[PDB]
Structure 1
């Protein structure tokens, strides 16, 4: 269902899609091939749904963490840049988009969260998370608040969760151990507990989302926010005097943001793979192309060495890199999606007070560790249990799996049932 002789590109709504459309226009000027840039909601969830049916965009942009899951599902074409091209990008950015020994996307830019602060409200930003409650008390007395950031996406809370020892999957000898998840260890609980105490003491609101935090910062209502390089354009036009700096420490340890490499993958079902490669290699990944996108919404530290060098003196980028150095480049393994879903629920339920930190993180740990078992059984049920009421009841039971033994016990009932 994907049309031949044109390029449809999907990119997130917080990125420079207008600048990306300018690169599309230069492609059109040169080749007469139409480039259409779209920014659908929930695109990282929408892509695997549509592309599995052989549909969707020719090119998809997202951070590299989602791509191993897409590759594993056979949704992506292997990309074929020659050595001369590969040498133009930082080698570690290629590593981020390598899956089972194959390159599965073009790396574009390195993104890390930083602390963004209003220099007029707060000339010297706090070095520690611990000093933020006292600062908020002081600012509330002037009708302001200390900190607002998106509490609906776990990406923004992760740096604090990881600071004292939270981790996604343990890295042991070149590989991530999908059995060893670190979302309910003592460090993770300490970080989430700190965040939930900020909410309990009314230094933040559980309902704060991206739009609310951005508006409050850009209007001068809050002294600090946590956000990525894409956010800087809007702060520029707002005429807040702002700085970008290292995230605060927690229990004397740096905050450790998960670092994303914005990446562009080619849909396995695209009839336009050679056009996609030509657009990405010869138009986007050039000084000219990245500058167009960057001018729209900043990219971060770009993967293309020549242009990265030109931008690096910007202290906002220097702070991005300092934060990236303290954090870790995300895994790209297929288990990342369930990890993020699990942590999103934990943070939302703990912050709303619907669950305690300990209960919220224990459930997230289980969901992340058992996600493979649960997917296997849901697939098995769908293929082998024709009675819909029986199937729904099995699906309910899958939701209750805590571990490998639970998985085996339920699999036995599903096999027994299908063979009746």
Structure 2
């Protein structure tokens, strides 16, 4: 579990964690309480896994969209700010961190993506996405490129995909209606097609990610990038002279970034909830607390009501709020992680020429719908191929982690899992399988600690009131169901079946197949021959 009398804080690696650690230092000086700030990789996925086991940070920082799912799973303490403290922050920021009426996190700041441009290379940045190809040809001639931004996270491609998004029209027998089809609509496919065509025509590279696009822009190699307020401080220290402006329009529509409220939640398992509350309310959410973080990496527009007319004094924050107004606040429904995973796949499959845009966004909608069913134990798939089938994915491409060690199963291990007729297990509505090493290890442990009895094959037929032929018998070492030949080997070679943990187990063909071995070990240690 978590250490009493100490605060552990997780926050994403692109935020001002160094400034946050200075707030923690001030907290220790004033109170004696030690604060440790960390930024684990993929912390938005690691938090519900470790918090489910009563472990993890005392405080987790993330955009508000993930917190609905955490709250639904019981992972967050209810937040109890006094009325006067609540009145310090914009009402809509509290609304972002409300879950079925209850406050589950403290809002910190409002973030949206903007267009960042090198003023020396591009005094007049383009107002439309459609200008960008021509501008890229001109800049290549000068040994530059027009635009580089992180294509790996759908957060960064969302603004363009969403720009012409819309409801779809429905029709039957002379009668028209309007229908919400999620991301499977013509406008979204239009924007995703435009992004793909940028890659097809070599205006962008599908492999570009955060650090590459950042390096390119801050070294003056590309004229434009797309990024949030946190990225300004690295550009500040670079020699680049940059501006921050409205994202380009697409088909005359504004780009529609998803707006995040950076928020701090308190682990439901923390024994330090009152300390966490004191830190968040009375040290971080002060002028000096937010300034220390913002000086490290800019927060965006802070949630404090006092700074409202100070916001537009900074043009970069005015541009942030302009893009924010043109986009939409992210939902915080518990299934937002399913939405994001489905869209991330659609965009990569599209930008890799794997799917058509239309098929990728149509699968995106139905995969998110299916993943939403992971909450229903009566309808969720418990076989790996059924999972694959319901997610429109080849076994060759599925990503699934071991329930024990959380590593992504390699392709060999995914095949074996399906081949051995094992069952998907759900932890907090996330499906898991198991890797080769964990199955083997816990096969061996299961063997010793749960050794009931042993019988010959003909005895087993009596105990089960079934013939050996169809009876499911798993190998005790690798869990593979024995085939009839392997059962026949048991009978002919007179090997028994062993009752391990309430069922009788056998050995497969493969698993079926020391005075000197130990004595070599002593030579390896130089003890004697």
d(CA) in 2 for partners of 1:394, 1:207 = 53
Conserved 8 A contact 1:146-1:222: yes
CA shift, 1:410, in A, is: 56
Conserved 8 A contact 1:216-1:222: yes
CA deviations over 1:310-359 (Å, ceiling 9, x no partner): 44310000000000000000000011100000000011110011111111
Conserved 8 A contact 1:96-1:332: yes
Please say which structure displays the higher CA radius of gyration: 2
CA deviations over 1:36-94 (Å, ceiling 9, x no partner): 00000000000001001111000000000000000000000000001100000000000
Which residue in the other structure is 2:495 paired with? 392
d(CA) in 1 for partners of 2:271, 2:313 = 41
Conserved 8 A contact 2:25-2:35: yes
Worse-matched range after superposition: 36-45 or 169-178: 169-178
d(CA) in 1 for partners of 2:183, 2:525 = 35
* Residues 103, 178 of structure 1: alpha-carbon distance in 2 compared, 3 angstrom cutoff: farther
* Residues 71, 202 of structure 1: alpha-carbon distance in 2 compared, 3 angstrom cutoff: same
* Residues 146, 17 of structure 1: alpha-carbon distance in 2 compared, 3 angstrom cutoff: same
Conserved 8 A contact 1:113-1:226: yes
SS at match of 2:316: helix
CA deviations over 1:15-38 (Å, ceiling 9, x no partner): 000000010011101000000000
Conserved 8 A contact 1:64-1:263: yes
CA deviations over 1:275-303 (Å, ceiling 9, x no partner): 00000000000101000000000000000
SS at match of 2:134: helix
d(CA) in 2 for partners of 1:396, 1:173 = 64
d(CA) in 2 for partners of 1:202, 1:399 = 61
Structure with greater proportional helix content: 1
* Residues 362, 31 of structure 1: alpha-carbon distance in 2 compared, 3 angstrom cutoff: same
Aligned CA-pair RMSD: 11.1
SS at match of 1:337: helix
Conserved 8 A contact 1:113-1:229: yes
Structure 1 segments, 4+ long, off by >3 Å, are: 166-181, 307-312, 373-380, 382-386, 390-404, 408-420
Conserved 8 A contact 1:111-1:300: yes
d(CA) in 2 for partners of 1:328, 1:144 = 33
Larger RCO (CA under 8 A, 6+ residues apart)? 1
SS at match of 2:350: helix
d(CA) in 1 for partners of 2:82, 2:121 = 51
CA shift, 1:307, in A, is: 3.7
d(CA) in 1 for partners of 2:519, 2:500 = 8
* Residues 409, 252 of structure 1: alpha-carbon distance in 2 compared, 3 angstrom cutoff: farther
Conserved 8 A contact 2:258-2:329: yes
* Residues 385, 313 of structure 1: alpha-carbon distance in 2 compared, 3 angstrom cutoff: closer
Conserved 8 A contact 1:9-1:58: yes
* Residues 302, 419 of structure 1: alpha-carbon distance in 2 compared, 3 angstrom cutoff: farther
* Residues 385, 320 of structure 1: alpha-carbon distance in 2 compared, 3 angstrom cutoff: closer
CA shift, 1:171, in A, is: 22
* Residues 189, 392 of structure 1: alpha-carbon distance in 2 compared, 3 angstrom cutoff: farther
* Residues 43, 72 of structure 1: alpha-carbon distance in 2 compared, 3 angstrom cutoff: same
Conserved 8 A contact 1:107-1:261: yes
Conserved 8 A contact 1:287-1:306: no
Conserved 8 A contact 1:114-1:227: yes
The number of residues matched between the two structures is 411
* Residues 414, 55 of structure 1: alpha-carbon distance in 2 compared, 3 angstrom cutoff: farther
* Residues 383, 326 of structure 1: alpha-carbon distance in 2 compared, 3 angstrom cutoff: closer
CA shift, 1:102, in A, is: 0.4
Conserved 8 A contact 1:378-1:395: no
Conserved 8 A contact 2:114-2:227: yes
* Residues 175, 46 of structure 1: alpha-carbon distance in 2 compared, 3 angstrom cutoff: farther
* Structure 2: gaps (5+ residues): 371-403, 412-426, 432-492, 508-516
* Residues 299, 412 of structure 1: alpha-carbon distance in 2 compared, 3 angstrom cutoff: farther
Conserved 8 A contact 2:96-2:261: yes
CA shift, 1:418, in A, is: 56
SS at match of 1:375: coil
